[PDB]
PDB file of all heavy atoms in Angstrom:
ATOM      1  N   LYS E  65      92.793  95.896 121.623  1.00 54.44           N
ATOM      2  CA  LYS E  65      94.290  96.023 121.507  1.00 54.44           C
ATOM      3  C   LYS E  65      94.719  97.268 120.723  1.00 54.44           C
ATOM      4  O   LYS E  65      94.103  97.552 119.657  1.00 54.44           O
ATOM      5  CB  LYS E  65      94.846  94.797 120.856  1.00 54.44           C
ATOM      6  CG  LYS E  65      94.848  93.556 121.718  1.00 54.44           C
ATOM      7  CD  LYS E  65      96.093  93.527 122.558  1.00 54.44           C
ATOM      8  CE  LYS E  65      97.348  93.252 121.707  1.00 54.44           C
ATOM      9  NZ  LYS E  65      98.600  93.159 122.529  1.00 54.44           N
ATOM     10  N   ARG E  66      95.719  97.969 121.207  1.00 53.28           N
ATOM     11  CA  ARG E  66      96.213  99.159 120.469  1.00 53.28           C
ATOM     12  C   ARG E  66      96.762  98.761 119.161  1.00 53.28           C
ATOM     13  O   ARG E  66      97.516  97.798 119.033  1.00 53.28           O
ATOM     14  CB  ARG E  66      97.262  99.893 121.280  1.00 53.28           C
ATOM     15  CG  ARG E  66      97.983 101.004 120.448  1.00 53.28           C
ATOM     16  CD  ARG E  66      99.087 101.658 121.209  1.00 53.28           C
ATOM     17  NE  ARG E  66      98.591 102.750 122.056  1.00 53.28           N
ATOM     18  CZ  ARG E  66      99.142 103.145 123.168  1.00 53.28           C
ATOM     19  NH1 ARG E  66     100.205 102.530 123.650  1.00 53.28           N
ATOM     20  NH2 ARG E  66      98.651 104.199 123.825  1.00 53.28           N
ATOM     21  N   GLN E  67      96.386  99.511 118.076  1.00 54.43           N
ATOM     22  CA  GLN E  67      96.885  99.228 116.756  1.00 54.43           C
ATOM     23  C   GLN E  67      97.939 100.322 116.500  1.00 54.43           C
ATOM     24  O   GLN E  67      99.119  99.997 116.301  1.00 54.43           O
ATOM     25  CB  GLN E  67      95.764  99.353 115.729  1.00 54.43           C
ATOM     26  CG  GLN E  67      96.147  98.756 114.404  1.00 54.43           C
ATOM     27  CD  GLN E  67      95.152  99.021 113.313  1.00 54.43           C
ATOM     28  OE1 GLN E  67      94.006  98.579 113.391  1.00 54.43           O
ATOM     29  NE2 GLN E  67      95.555  99.737 112.268  1.00 54.43           N
ATOM     30  N   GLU E  68      97.560 101.554 116.584  1.00 58.91           N
ATOM     31  CA  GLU E  68      98.492 102.685 116.374  1.00 58.91           C
ATOM     32  C   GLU E  68      97.890 103.918 117.115  1.00 58.91           C
ATOM     33  O   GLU E  68      96.737 104.191 116.943  1.00 58.91           O
ATOM     34  CB  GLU E  68      98.669 102.947 114.894  1.00 58.91           C
ATOM     35  CG  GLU E  68      97.549 103.682 114.129  1.00 58.91           C
ATOM     36  CD  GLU E  68      96.849 102.791 113.105  1.00 58.91           C
ATOM     37  OE1 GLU E  68      97.350 102.645 111.981  1.00 58.91           O
ATOM     38  OE2 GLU E  68      95.734 102.253 113.394  1.00 58.91           O
ATOM     39  N   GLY E  69      98.748 104.581 117.905  1.00 62.51           N
ATOM     40  CA  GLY E  69      98.288 105.744 118.627  1.00 62.51           C
ATOM     41  C   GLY E  69      97.105 105.448 119.511  1.00 62.51           C
ATOM     42  O   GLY E  69      97.200 104.611 120.403  1.00 62.51           O
ATOM     43  N   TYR E  70      95.981 106.095 119.302  1.00 63.65           N
ATOM     44  CA  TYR E  70      94.792 105.851 120.092  1.00 63.65           C
ATOM     45  C   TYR E  70      93.717 105.125 119.274  1.00 63.65           C
ATOM     46  O   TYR E  70      92.502 105.346 119.500  1.00 63.65           O
ATOM     47  CB  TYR E  70      94.282 107.144 120.716  1.00 63.65           C
ATOM     48  CG  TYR E  70      95.313 107.753 121.638  1.00 63.65           C
ATOM     49  CD1 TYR E  70      96.024 108.883 121.277  1.00 63.65           C
ATOM     50  CD2 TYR E  70      95.594 107.163 122.886  1.00 63.65           C
ATOM     51  CE1 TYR E  70      97.073 109.386 122.042  1.00 63.65           C
ATOM     52  CE2 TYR E  70      96.631 107.667 123.696  1.00 63.65           C
ATOM     53  CZ  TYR E  70      97.348 108.777 123.275  1.00 63.65           C
ATOM     54  OH  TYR E  70      98.360 109.347 124.066  1.00 63.65           O
ATOM     55  N   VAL E  71      94.175 104.292 118.365  1.00 62.60           N
ATOM     56  CA  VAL E  71      93.294 103.456 117.514  1.00 62.60           C
ATOM     57  C   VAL E  71      93.472 102.020 118.038  1.00 62.60           C
ATOM     58  O   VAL E  71      94.593 101.534 118.064  1.00 62.60           O
ATOM     59  CB  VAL E  71      93.720 103.482 116.052  1.00 62.60           C
ATOM     60  CG1 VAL E  71      92.819 102.570 115.239  1.00 62.60           C
ATOM     61  CG2 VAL E  71      93.730 104.902 115.538  1.00 62.60           C
ATOM     62  N   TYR E  72      92.385 101.408 118.506  1.00 62.78           N
ATOM     63  CA  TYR E  72      92.409 100.014 119.011  1.00 62.78           C
ATOM     64  C   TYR E  72      91.542  99.159 118.149  1.00 62.78           C
ATOM     65  O   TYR E  72      90.716  99.657 117.400  1.00 62.78           O
ATOM     66  CB  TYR E  72      91.847 100.050 120.423  1.00 62.78           C
ATOM     67  CG  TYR E  72      92.584 100.866 121.398  1.00 62.78           C
ATOM     68  CD1 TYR E  72      92.412 102.250 121.485  1.00 62.78           C
ATOM     69  CD2 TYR E  72      93.508 100.288 122.262  1.00 62.78           C
ATOM     70  CE1 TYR E  72      93.191 103.076 122.319  1.00 62.78           C
ATOM     71  CE2 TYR E  72      94.275 101.080 123.116  1.00 62.78           C
ATOM     72  CZ  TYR E  72      94.130 102.441 123.138  1.00 62.78           C
ATOM     73  OH  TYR E  72      94.929 103.193 123.975  1.00 62.78           O
ATOM     74  N   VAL E  73      91.729  97.882 118.210  1.00 61.12           N
ATOM     75  CA  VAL E  73      90.926  96.928 117.450  1.00 61.12           C
ATOM     76  C   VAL E  73      90.193  95.991 118.412  1.00 61.12           C
ATOM     77  O   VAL E  73      90.742  95.551 119.437  1.00 61.12           O
ATOM     78  CB  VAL E  73      91.804  96.042 116.479  1.00 61.12           C
ATOM     79  CG1 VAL E  73      90.883  95.056 115.709  1.00 61.12           C
ATOM     80  CG2 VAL E  73      92.516  96.957 115.521  1.00 61.12           C
ATOM     81  N   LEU E  74      88.944  95.740 118.121  1.00 67.13           N
ATOM     82  CA  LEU E  74      88.065  94.999 118.973  1.00 67.13           C
ATOM     83  C   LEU E  74      87.071  94.126 118.183  1.00 67.13           C
ATOM     84  O   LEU E  74      86.468  94.614 117.187  1.00 67.13           O
ATOM     85  CB  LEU E  74      87.309  95.933 119.865  1.00 67.13           C
ATOM     86  CG  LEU E  74      86.212  95.552 120.834  1.00 67.13           C
ATOM     87  CD1 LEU E  74      86.782  94.718 121.953  1.00 67.13           C
ATOM     88  CD2 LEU E  74      85.604  96.791 121.369  1.00 67.13           C
ATOM     89  N   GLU E  75      86.934  92.858 118.566  1.00 64.90           N
ATOM     90  CA  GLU E  75      85.998  91.954 117.954  1.00 64.90           C
ATOM     91  C   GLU E  75      84.817  92.021 118.856  1.00 64.90           C
ATOM     92  O   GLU E  75      84.894  91.679 120.017  1.00 64.90           O
ATOM     93  CB  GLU E  75      86.586  90.529 117.870  1.00 64.90           C
ATOM     94  CG  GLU E  75      85.829  89.559 117.048  1.00 64.90           C
ATOM     95  CD  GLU E  75      85.957  89.825 115.520  1.00 64.90           C
ATOM     96  OE1 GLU E  75      86.871  90.515 115.093  1.00 64.90           O
ATOM     97  OE2 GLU E  75      85.114  89.234 114.756  1.00 64.90           O
ATOM     98  N   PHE E  76      83.703  92.525 118.311  1.00 65.05           N
ATOM     99  CA  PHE E  76      82.465  92.706 119.034  1.00 65.05           C
ATOM    100  C   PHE E  76      81.398  92.893 117.954  1.00 65.05           C
ATOM    101  O   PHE E  76      81.441  93.945 117.288  1.00 65.05           O
ATOM    102  CB  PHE E  76      82.551  93.912 119.928  1.00 65.05           C
ATOM    103  CG  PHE E  76      81.295  94.256 120.726  1.00 65.05           C
ATOM    104  CD1 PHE E  76      81.021  93.536 121.871  1.00 65.05           C
ATOM    105  CD2 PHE E  76      80.383  95.205 120.265  1.00 65.05           C
ATOM    106  CE1 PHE E  76      79.863  93.768 122.618  1.00 65.05           C
ATOM    107  CE2 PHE E  76      79.218  95.488 121.010  1.00 65.05           C
ATOM    108  CZ  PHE E  76      78.971  94.751 122.173  1.00 65.05           C
ATOM    109  N   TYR E  77      80.513  91.909 117.802  1.00 65.16           N
ATOM    110  CA  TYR E  77      79.504  91.951 116.734  1.00 65.16           C
ATOM    111  C   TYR E  77      80.137  92.301 115.394  1.00 65.16           C
ATOM    112  O   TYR E  77      79.609  93.119 114.654  1.00 65.16           O
ATOM    113  CB  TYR E  77      78.309  92.831 117.119  1.00 65.16           C
ATOM    114  CG  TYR E  77      77.390  92.177 118.137  1.00 65.16           C
ATOM    115  CD1 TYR E  77      77.347  92.673 119.480  1.00 65.16           C
ATOM    116  CD2 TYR E  77      76.600  91.091 117.841  1.00 65.16           C
ATOM    117  CE1 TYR E  77      76.570  92.022 120.434  1.00 65.16           C
ATOM    118  CE2 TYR E  77      75.809  90.460 118.784  1.00 65.16           C
ATOM    119  CZ  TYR E  77      75.765  90.938 120.089  1.00 65.16           C
ATOM    120  OH  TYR E  77      75.026  90.289 121.080  1.00 65.16           O
ATOM    121  N   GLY E  78      81.306  91.694 115.173  1.00 65.76           N
ATOM    122  CA  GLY E  78      82.044  91.968 113.946  1.00 65.76           C
ATOM    123  C   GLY E  78      83.405  92.542 114.317  1.00 65.76           C
ATOM    124  O   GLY E  78      83.780  92.533 115.499  1.00 65.76           O
ATOM    125  N   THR E  79      84.123  93.033 113.316  1.00 64.85           N
ATOM    126  CA  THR E  79      85.440  93.615 113.573  1.00 64.85           C
ATOM    127  C   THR E  79      85.303  95.148 113.720  1.00 64.85           C
ATOM    128  O   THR E  79      84.616  95.791 112.974  1.00 64.85           O
ATOM    129  CB  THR E  79      86.420  93.340 112.354  1.00 64.85           C
ATOM    130  OG1 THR E  79      86.585  91.926 112.196  1.00 64.85           O
ATOM    131  CG2 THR E  79      87.807  93.941 112.625  1.00 64.85           C
ATOM    132  N   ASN E  80      85.993  95.668 114.758  1.00 66.00           N
ATOM    133  CA  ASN E  80      85.925  97.092 115.049  1.00 66.00           C
ATOM    134  C   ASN E  80      87.248  97.782 115.209  1.00 66.00           C
ATOM    135  O   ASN E  80      88.211  97.157 115.597  1.00 66.00           O
ATOM    136  CB  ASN E  80      85.181  97.318 116.379  1.00 66.00           C
ATOM    137  CG  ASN E  80      83.792  96.756 116.430  1.00 66.00           C
ATOM    138  OD1 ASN E  80      82.834  97.399 116.014  1.00 66.00           O
ATOM    139  ND2 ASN E  80      83.670  95.518 116.932  1.00 66.00           N
ATOM    140  N   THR E  81      87.291  99.054 114.784  1.00 63.61           N
ATOM    141  CA  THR E  81      88.412  99.876 115.048  1.00 63.61           C
ATOM    142  C   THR E  81      87.790 100.942 115.930  1.00 63.61           C
ATOM    143  O   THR E  81      86.746 101.489 115.543  1.00 63.61           O
ATOM    144  CB  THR E  81      89.013 100.553 113.811  1.00 63.61           C
ATOM    145  OG1 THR E  81      87.964 101.260 113.123  1.00 63.61           O
ATOM    146  CG2 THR E  81      89.718  99.570 112.890  1.00 63.61           C
ATOM    147  N   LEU E  82      88.326 101.118 117.117  1.00 63.70           N
ATOM    148  CA  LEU E  82      87.793 102.112 118.067  1.00 63.70           C
ATOM    149  C   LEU E  82      88.920 103.142 118.236  1.00 63.70           C
ATOM    150  O   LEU E  82      90.028 102.850 118.572  1.00 63.70           O
ATOM    151  CB  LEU E  82      87.447 101.432 119.395  1.00 63.70           C
ATOM    152  CG  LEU E  82      86.877 102.301 120.522  1.00 63.70           C
ATOM    153  CD1 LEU E  82      85.981 101.468 121.431  1.00 63.70           C
ATOM    154  CD2 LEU E  82      88.002 102.967 121.355  1.00 63.70           C
ATOM    155  N   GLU E  83      88.572 104.407 117.978  1.00 62.93           N
ATOM    156  CA  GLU E  83      89.574 105.482 118.179  1.00 62.93           C
ATOM    157  C   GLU E  83      89.099 106.502 119.225  1.00 62.93           C
ATOM    158  O   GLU E  83      87.946 106.900 119.213  1.00 62.93           O
ATOM    159  CB  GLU E  83      89.837 106.215 116.846  1.00 62.93           C
ATOM    160  CG  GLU E  83      90.889 107.267 116.929  1.00 62.93           C
ATOM    161  CD  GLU E  83      91.117 107.997 115.642  1.00 62.93           C
ATOM    162  OE1 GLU E  83      90.363 107.752 114.664  1.00 62.93           O
ATOM    163  OE2 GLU E  83      92.032 108.830 115.597  1.00 62.93           O
ATOM    164  N   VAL E  84      89.983 106.899 120.149  1.00 60.11           N
ATOM    165  CA  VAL E  84      89.623 107.873 121.113  1.00 60.11           C
ATOM    166  C   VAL E  84      89.960 109.174 120.414  1.00 60.11           C
ATOM    167  O   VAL E  84      91.111 109.344 120.070  1.00 60.11           O
ATOM    168  CB  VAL E  84      90.436 107.770 122.426  1.00 60.11           C
ATOM    169  CG1 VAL E  84      90.129 108.914 123.391  1.00 60.11           C
ATOM    170  CG2 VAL E  84      90.072 106.437 123.075  1.00 60.11           C
ATOM    171  N   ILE E  85      88.953 109.944 120.094  1.00 62.28           N
ATOM    172  CA  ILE E  85      89.196 111.186 119.323  1.00 62.28           C
ATOM    173  C   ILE E  85      89.204 112.450 120.226  1.00 62.28           C
ATOM    174  O   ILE E  85      89.668 113.477 119.808  1.00 62.28           O
ATOM    175  CB  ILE E  85      88.176 111.349 118.187  1.00 62.28           C
ATOM    176  CG1 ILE E  85      86.726 111.371 118.706  1.00 62.28           C
ATOM    177  CG2 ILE E  85      88.370 110.252 117.141  1.00 62.28           C
ATOM    178  CD1 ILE E  85      85.685 111.688 117.621  1.00 62.28           C
ATOM    179  N   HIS E  86      88.711 112.294 121.461  1.00 63.34           N
ATOM    180  CA  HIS E  86      88.635 113.417 122.388  1.00 63.34           C
ATOM    181  C   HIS E  86      88.475 112.855 123.801  1.00 63.34           C
ATOM    182  O   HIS E  86      87.619 112.012 124.063  1.00 63.34           O
ATOM    183  CB  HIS E  86      87.433 114.257 122.045  1.00 63.34           C
ATOM    184  CG  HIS E  86      87.216 115.365 123.070  1.00 63.34           C
ATOM    185  ND1 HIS E  86      87.711 116.618 122.937  1.00 63.34           N
ATOM    186  CD2 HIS E  86      86.574 115.317 124.300  1.00 63.34           C
ATOM    187  CE1 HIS E  86      87.403 117.327 124.020  1.00 63.34           C
ATOM    188  NE2 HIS E  86      86.729 116.562 124.859  1.00 63.34           N
TER     189      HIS E  86
END
Side-chain angles (χ1 to χ4, degrees):
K65 287 274 291 183
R66 168 184 276 151
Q67 194 188 298
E68 75 248 280
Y70 299 104
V71 179
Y72 299 78
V73 179
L74 174 68
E75 190 72 18
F76 180 79
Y77 283 108
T79 300
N80 302 272
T81 52
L82 180 152
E83 183 181 6
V84 173
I85 60 174
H86 173 94

